[PDB]
Write a protein that binds this ligand. Sequence first.
Ligand SMILES: O=C(c1cc(Cl)c(O)c(Cl)c1)N1CS(=O)(=O)c2ccccc21
Length: 435
Amino acid sequence: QTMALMVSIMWLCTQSMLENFSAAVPSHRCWAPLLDNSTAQALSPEALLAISIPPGPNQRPHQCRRFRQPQWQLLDPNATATSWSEADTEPCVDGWVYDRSIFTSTIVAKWNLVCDSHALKPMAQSIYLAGILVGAAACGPASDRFGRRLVLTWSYLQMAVMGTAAAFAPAFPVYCLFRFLLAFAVAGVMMNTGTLLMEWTARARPLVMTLNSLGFSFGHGLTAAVAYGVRDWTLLQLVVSVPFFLCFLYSWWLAESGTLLRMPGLRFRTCISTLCWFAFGFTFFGLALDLQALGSNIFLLQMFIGVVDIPAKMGALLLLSHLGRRPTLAASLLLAGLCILANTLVPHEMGALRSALAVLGLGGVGAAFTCITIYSSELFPTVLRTAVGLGQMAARGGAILGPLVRLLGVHGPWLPLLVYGTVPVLSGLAALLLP
Ligand SMILES: O=C(c1cc(Cl)c(O)c(Cl)c1)N1CS(=O)(=O)c2ccccc21
């Protein structure tokens, strides 16, 4: 049934977007004696925070440095500001405390993802996407040998097990391994769902496709409410993985009640298709995992993303039927690129406009994915149609490289978004030359 696959892809969407909320970084500072000790520390907590922690980014108290001694010189206005020396600070060693207003417990606040380990969250996303790649590369022969239903049930069981395991992970490497196995099973489910929806009915192939995307969509759209309802990441992952335990009931139908010629042949079409897939995967998995910086409210941002991505990718099929395949694809790619570029061009004070631009860019990359996945079925004849698998592998590689460019935020907060806006523009300019 199509409804079962839609529910499955919606829950896989919740599992995928779980990383955007469980790895959210709140405003943090490390333990200070004049702010977290007993009453003897004294009134005016802002003055205590100012004299105990030097200023930092965005004219805020430094989230990564603490004063070893209380600097009373900055509190009295008669003295010159920024008079403290660098030697008076200590490397924020006494452990970090986090704001429990928005999120009560996250993977950043649990394992102390701080300056020295700030690359762990993008490294965790990269490990997840590498697990996705390994699963997509491995479950192929497994599905061809052991059957699609058996590997589907095994992947569902693995998703459930790894979800319940990562919900209670005591260490960071163990959590990374759990996420790697969960991503392996996610990729297995993805491959099986794609292989089944490609040939269950198909003329109706574009309709079925539009459909699994209206899918991941209703998804991010429902995962925002789930993240808003459950403030603890452990119980959040638990209640996200329980639906997979429920879907495991359909195992065994209720108990019975090669192709390397894609590179030399059509090399131009092959490289262009792989470039578009790489660009889409890169942009999507680089933007959909850092929504905290793209908007002011992550939940409202995701809800707006979904409610605007529904009609865009709905009319994407009308555009494909009326205007063609290449023109609408190039137009959507250029629109997404221009939106992500204007997201950096606009100042950060226009939060609503930044959120709107991010939503428009995500809708554009979704429409571009729809266009390219409809066009890949006609770029190559039946003899060459594993070009689709090669494009999928290229998109997975782009997804993997996605979080790796986010490390450039030290050189500037706009560089990752600058790349996320520049890559789709070049992708559309290259796809414009398609026949
Ligand atoms: O990862 C993939 C993916 C990769 C390949 Cl190679 C595929 O063939 C397919 Cl169908 C999906 N995503 C991530 S997503 O947000 O679910 C999402 C939403 C909409 C379209 C694709 C897609």
